[PDB]
């Protein structure tokens, strides 16, 4: 059984192997725009008294 033990260890050491992927994340970004931007206007002839 010393032989078997050694065999266990050898097989165990040799055998193991794997690879995995992980992806830690979380999307947190804040885009804040307040009073600032433009709309649009048409053309109209105006005049004030």
């Amino acid at each position: 059984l010393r032989k078997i033990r050694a065999a266990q260890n050898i097989s165990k050491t040799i055998a193991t192997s794997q690879n995995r992927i992980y992806l830690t994340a979380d999307n947190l970004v804040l885009n804040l725009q307040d009073e600032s931007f433009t709309r649009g206007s048409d053309s109209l002839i105006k005049g004030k008294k």
């Binding site: 059984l1 794997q18 995995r20 992806l23």
Partner: protein, 54 residues
């Protein structure tokens, strides 16, 4: 000594004892060599904020 014990118990336990211990061990061997697996996502966020006009 473990070998001695196993063999001894095997003998008391008879042939049937031997067979399934062999299969368990074989299964173990298969386990150790074979292990592999992976999981993944496609991380995309996105949420919906629905607002009704008033």
């Amino acid at each position: 000594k473990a070998a001695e014990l196993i063999a001894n118990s095997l003998a008391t336990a008879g042939d049937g004892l031997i067979e399934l211990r062999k299969l368990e061990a074989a299964e173990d061997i298969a386990y150790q060599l074979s292990r592999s697996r992976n999981i993944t996502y496609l991380p995309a966020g996105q949420s919906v904020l629905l607002q009704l006009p008033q």
